[PDB]
């Protein structure tokens, strides 16, 4: 699958720095231009600089757009757009609306961070959840669950599910099941023209 290739190549490691020391780790999945999908809860941490693929930047180097996602809310999938940078492959055409998973179907999470390096995890789909409450008392909308073995740091990694496609970015997990924030191709498309 050239797709598994494309996505793997767009996934870059992220690191938050505070007082010269690394204080957080996760992944970023390039979607087009210099736009990257990233866990929104990532910005809830205190930091001085953000390192994307070894490149250190400050808040004056990019913009972070959030997603309204209608339920009955802010999704955990934020889009980080660098003012300048090296282009990534445009894979928005691999997200969907024009379909939907189904309990059982194969699931593949793509990771690339500083804790474990490049890696892939597989599991089986479950269902789509409108809201999931985390163990810290927080909540997250539009999530797709799946049977998988995940760990801290996978957040932001791409999750794939005969034709293959991209569901969204990994956000949370636990006791054998993982959750990713879903992303529609149209929302990414509208976001592409907005950032031009």
């Amino acid at each position: 699958t050239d797709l598994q290739k494309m996505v793997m190549g767009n996934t870059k490691p992220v690191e938050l720095i505070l007082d010269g020391k690394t204080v957080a780790i996760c992944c970023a999945t390039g979607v087009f231009g210099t736009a990257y999908l990233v866990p929104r809860h990532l910005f809830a941490e205190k930091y001085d600089k953000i390192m994307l693929d070894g490149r250190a930047m400050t808040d004056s180097d990019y913009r972070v757009f959030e997603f309204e996602i209608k339920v009955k809310m802010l999704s955990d999938a934020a889009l980080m757009v660098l003012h300048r940078g090296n282009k990534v492959r445009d894979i928005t055409k691999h997200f969907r609306d024009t379909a939907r998973m189904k309990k059982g179907t194969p699931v593949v999470g793509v990771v690339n961070n500083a804790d474990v390096g490049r890696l892939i995890f597989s599991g089986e789909a479950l269902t789509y959840k409108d809201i999931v409450v985390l163990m810290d008392g927080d909540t997250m909308p539009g999530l797709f669950a799946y049977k998988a073995a995940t760990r801290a740091g996978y957040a932001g990694g791409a999750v794939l599910a005969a034709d293959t496609f991209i569901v969204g970015t990994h956000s949370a997990g636990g006791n054998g099941v993982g959750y990713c924030s879903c992303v529609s191709r149209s929302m990414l498309q509208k976001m592409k023209a907005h950032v031009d």
Binding site: K21, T22, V23, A24, I25, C26, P39, H41, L42, E45, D76, N113, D115, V132, V133, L134, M135, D136, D138, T150, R151, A152, G153, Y154, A155, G156, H170, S171, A172, G173, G174, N175, V177, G178, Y179
Partner: peptide, 9 residues
Amino acid sequence: APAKQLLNF
């Protein structure tokens, strides 16, 4: 309940 999986230090 699941936990946010951003690796914190």
